[PDB]
Amino acid sequence: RKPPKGMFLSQEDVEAVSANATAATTVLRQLDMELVSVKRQIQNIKQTNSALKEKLDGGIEPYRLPEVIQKCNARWTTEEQLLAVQAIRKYGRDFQAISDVIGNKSVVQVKNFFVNYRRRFNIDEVLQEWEAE
Amino acid sequence: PRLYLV
C-alpha cells in the first residue's frame, strides 16, 4: 500500500529521476547548488543582524524615567483642567494617554470630563482641530 | 534465487 517507512518514493519523483541518462545527477545538483545558495544567504543575514544588534547595545537604560506611583484623585484642580484641554488638543479621544498626562485621573474620569466641561471648554472645537492634523 | 541469501 505504502513505501516502507523511511523510504520516500512518490510517483512524480520516479519519473523525474528517470527522465534521461543523467536526469538523476541533474536534479541532485540543482539541490546541491540550492543548498549553497541558501546556506550563504544565512550567513549574510546572520552578519546583517549581528551588526544591528551591536547598534542596540546597552538597551534603552540611559533613557528610562522612574515610576510615578501616584494616588488617583476626584477633584479637578484648575491646573489639571488646563492640562486636560491641552491633552485633548494633542491626543484627541485617546483617554488613556490623557489619563497618564494628568496622572491623578482615571480613564473614566477623563471620559466624564469630556461631557461635563464639554460646555465650557468648547471640546468640540478642540477635537475638530486635532483631526485637522 | 532469494533462498541462498546469507
Binding site: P3, M7, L31, I42, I45, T48, L52, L65 | R2, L5
Partner: protein, 666 residues
C-alpha cells in the same frame, strides 16, 4: 504441521484441496460431491504419511490398503488409483529404497537420458522402477554434474551444491533418510570485516543491513505499486531499480536540508525586520529623552503649557519605552527559536563512503544468491519463487554432497566420458550421436523411443551450439533459452592444518574496496570437521576471476585472512582448489536466474517436450519424443538440487505416462 495433514505439507501439497495435477487424473472426483473429495484427500494424505514415516522400503498397494480404515478402505479401486498416481509422479517410492517385488522380467520402451546430473539420475531411477530400458550419457568421468565434491585425504569440500535449504517440505529430507547424509545446521550470525581487516561495529552493521532490506522492499514497491517495469522499451533490472531508489533517498536527504535551512532564513529574516524596528525606536527614544530633559531644565515656576510639555514628553516616552520592552520580548522568543532549529539539523548525508561500502557487501550477498550482477536480474520476477521456499534451518552435507548422486547412480546404466553431439528425433523415434571425450573421433549411435535432455541451460545456450538438434528446436523453445539467465558463482577451497578462526562462527564476510570488486572473496565458510575455509567469488567479480590463476587467487585469500586474524596467525594452505563454472564446458555457468525480460513462465516453456513432424505427410500427429528435465525447468524450485531432483521425477512420470500408459484414469 504433523499427522496426516503434515505429510501433505512435507509433500508440497495442500492437505485440504485437490491440486491441478490431481484434477487432471481424477476429474470424476473433483467435479463430483464434496464428500468424495475429502475421502480422496485423506487417502492421498494417509498414503503419503505411510511412505514418509518409512522411506527406506517400497510402499505397495497391498501394504497401503492393509493400513487403511473404514470407510476409506471400502472402495479399493479408489485406493489403487491414488496409490498409482502417487507412485507415478514420484511422491511415493522415489530415491533409494528396498523393492518388495523385484523388478519386472523384461523391459518396455527405450529411453536415452542426456547427462547424469541429479535431475538425470532421479528420472533414470524412476523410469527403471517403471520397468523401462534406461541409459544415461555423461560427458564427465563422474556423476552429479553441478554437484561437485573435492576429496583429498580427510579434506571434503563442495565446489558445487553445498546447502540443503531447509527440510520443511524438502524432497531431500526423504533422500537424507535413505542415504548416509551428515546434516549440520548453519548458524545465522555473520560478522563483517572492512578493507582494513577490522570488524564493523554492531551499531553500523545492524543499521546498514536494516537499510538494505528496506531498499529491497522499496524496489518491490516500485515494481508492483508504482509499476516501474519498462524504461526506454528495455525491462528494468533490480540493479537499475536499486540505483533509482538510492537516488530518491539521497534526493530526500537534500530536500530535508533545503526546507530546514529555508525555515531558518524565514526566522532570521523576521529577526532582521524586528531589529530594524527596534533600532528606529531607540533612535526616537534617544531624541525624545533629550526633548524631555530640555523641558525639565525650565525651572519652576512655569505656565501651564510649559508644564504640560514636561508631562506630555513624559507620557510620550514611557509609551515608547513600553513598545521597546514588548519588542525585546519578541526578540527573546525568536532568538531562542533560531537556537532551536540550529540545534537539531536533519541528516547530513544518506550514506557515507564507509556506509556505502558495507551496503555493497549486502548487494554482493544478493549477487551471490542469484549468481549474477543485479543489473541482469528481472525487477518484477527475480524473486518469483519466494512463496515456495522450504521451512527450517539450512544445513550442510558434512560428508560431502557427492554421496547423493553417487548413491543414486547405483544400479544404473551410465556411459561416462560420452559427449552427446547431436540429437535426432523423428516421428518413428530417436537417435543420439555421442563421442568419446578422450579419443574424440570415436563415435557412438544410440537408438531410443524418447530422449530426456538434462543439459544445463548454459550448455543449451552455447553459440555455436555444443549439441545439435535435428530437426532444429522450435522458435518458442530457443527464445526461452535466450531470454532466460544462466548465472555464475565460484568457490575457493582452503585446506589448513589448524583452525585459526572462530570455531563457533560458520561464516564471516569481508567488505571490498569498490562496488566493482564487491563480490570478490566477499564471504568465507567454516562448515566441515576438518580445518577448511571456503571463499565465495560472486557478482561481476565471479566472471573476471576465472582469467586469474589459483596462486594469485589464493594470495588474495590469505591477504584478507591475514588482515582479519593476524599476519602470522594465517599459515600456508596445504591444499587449494578453485572452481571455474563459466569455463567448465559441461556447465557453462553455475545456475539459472530470472533475467530481465524473462519471467517464471519461461521455466515452464523449458519443461514442455518436443513433438516431431510426421514422417509421411498427412499421417497422424506423432508422440512427443524429446523431453527436458533440469534445474532450469522447474519454475517453483529453480537453481537448487531438490529442484533438479523434482524435475527429474516430473519428466519420468510424463515419459512413463506417454509410453506405458496411465492405468489410473478410469
Amino acid at each position: 504441521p504433523s499427522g496426516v495433514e503434515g505429510a501433505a505439507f512435507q509433500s508440497r501439497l495442500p492437505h485440504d484441496r485437490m491440486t491441478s495435477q490431481e484434477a487432471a487424473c481424477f476429474p470424476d472426483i473433483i467435479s463430483g460431491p464434496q464428500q468424495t473429495q475429502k475421502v480422496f484427500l485423506f487417502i492421498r494424505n494417509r498414503t503419503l504419511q505411510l511412505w514418509l514415516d518409512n522411506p527406506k522400503i517400497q510402499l505397495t498397494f497391498e501394504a497401503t490398503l492393509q493400513q487403511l480404515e473404514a470407510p476409506y478402505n471400502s472402495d479399493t479401486v479408489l485406493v489403487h488409483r491414488v496409490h498409482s498416481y502417487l507412485e507415478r509422479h514420484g511422491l511415493i517410492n522415489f530415491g533409494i529404497y528396498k523393492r518388495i517385488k523385484p523388478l519386472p522380467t523384461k523391459k518396455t520402451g527405450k529411453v536415452i537420458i542426456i547427462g547424469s546430473g541429479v535431475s538425470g539420475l532421479a528420472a533414470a531411477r524412476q523410469l527403471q522402477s517403471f520397468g523401462m530400458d534406461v541409459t544415461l550419457l555423461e560427458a564427465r568421468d563422474r556423476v552429479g554434474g553441478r554437484v561437485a565434491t573435492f576429496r583429498k585425504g580427510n579434506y571434503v569440500a563442495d565446489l558445487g551444491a553445498m546447502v540443503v535449504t531447509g527440510l520443511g517440505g524438502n524432497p531431500m529430507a526423504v533422500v537424507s533418510k535413505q542415504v548416509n547424509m551428515e546434516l549440520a545446521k548453519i548458524k545465522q550470525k555473520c560478522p563483517l570485516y572492512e578493507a582494513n581487516g577490522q570488524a564493523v561495529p554492531k551499531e553500523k552493521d545492524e543499521m546498514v543491513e536494516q537499510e538494505f532490506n528496506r531498499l529491497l522492499e522499496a524496489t518491490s514497491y516500485l515494481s508492483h505499486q508504482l509499476d516501474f517495469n519498462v524504461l526506454n522499451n528495455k525491462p528494468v533490472s533490480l540493479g537499475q531499480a536499486l540505483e533509482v531508489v538510492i537516488q530518491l533517498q539521497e534526493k530526500h536527504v537534500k530536500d530535508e536540508q533545503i526546507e530546514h535551512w529555508k525555515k531558518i532564513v524565514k526566522t532570521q529574516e523576521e529577526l532582521k525586520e524586528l531589529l530594524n524596528k527596534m533600532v528606529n525606536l531607540k533612535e526616537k527614544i534617544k531624541e525624545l529623552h533629550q526633548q524631555y530633559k530640555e523641558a525639565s531644565e525650565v525651572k519652576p515656576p512655569r505656565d501651564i503649557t510649559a508644564e504640560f510639555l514636561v508631562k506630555s514628553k513624559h507620557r510620550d516616552l514611557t509609551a515608547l519605552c513600553k513598545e521597546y520592552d514588548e519588542l525585546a520580548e519578541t526578540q527573546g522568543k525568536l532568538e531562542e527559536k533560531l537556537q532551536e532549529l540550529e540545534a537539531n539539523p536533519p541528516s547530513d548525508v544518506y550514506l557515507s563512503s564507509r556506509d556505502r561500502q558495507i551496503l555493497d557487501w549486502h548487494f554482493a550477498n544478493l549477487e551471490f544468491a542469484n549468481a549474477t550482477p543485479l543489473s541482469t536480474l528481472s525487477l518484477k520476477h527475480w524473486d518469483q519463487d519466494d512463496d515456495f521456499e522450504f521451512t527450517g534451518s539450512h544445513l550442510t552435507v558434512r560428508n560431502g554432497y557427492s554421496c547423493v548422486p553417487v548413491a543414486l547412480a547405483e544400479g544404473l546404466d551410465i556411459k561416462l566420458n560420452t559427449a552427446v553431439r547431436q540429437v535426432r528425433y523423428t516421428a518413428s523415434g530417436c537417435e543420439v550421436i555421442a563421442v568419446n571425450t578422450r579419443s574424440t573421433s570415436q563415435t557412438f549411435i544410440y537408438k531410443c523411443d524418447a530422449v530426456l535432455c538434462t543439459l544445463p541451460l548454459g550448455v543449451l545456450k552455447q553459440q555455436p551450439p555444443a549439441v545439435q538438434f535435428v530437426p532444429p528446436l522450435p522458435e518458442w523453445k530457443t527464445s526461452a533459452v535466450q531470454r532466460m539467465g544462466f548465472g555464475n558463482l565460484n568457490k575457493v577451497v582452503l585446506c589448513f592444518d589448524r583452525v585459526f578462526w572462530d570455531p563457533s562462527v560458520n561464516l564471516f564476510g569481508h567488505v571490498g574496496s569498490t562496488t566493482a570488486s564487491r563480490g570478490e572473496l566477499f564471504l568465507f565458510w567454516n562448515l566441515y570437521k576438518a580445518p577448511i575455509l571456503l571463499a565465495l567469488v560472486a557478482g561481476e567479480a565471479a566472471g573476471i576471476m576465472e582469467n586469474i590463476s589459483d596462486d594469485v587467487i589464493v594470495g588474495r585469500c590469505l591477504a584478507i585472512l591475514k588482515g582479519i586474524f593476524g599476519s602470522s596467525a594465517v599459515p600456508q594452505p596445504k591444499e587449494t582448489v578453485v572452481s571455474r563454472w563459466r569455463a567448465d564446458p559441461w556447465a557453462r555457468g553455475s545456475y539459472s536466474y530470472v533475467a530481465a525480460g524473462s519471467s517464471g513462465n519461461d521455466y515452464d516453456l523449458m519443461a514442455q517436450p518436443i513433438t516431431p513432424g510426421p514422417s509421411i505427410p498427412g499421417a497422424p500427429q506423432p508422440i512427443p519424443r524429446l523431453f527436458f528435465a533440469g534445474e532450469h525447468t522447474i519454475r517453483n524450485y529453480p537453481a537448487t538440487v531438490h529442484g533438479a531432483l523434482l524435475s527429474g521425477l516430473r519428466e519420468a512420470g510424463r515419459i512413463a505416462d506417454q509410453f506405458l500408459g496411465a492405468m489410473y484414469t478410469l
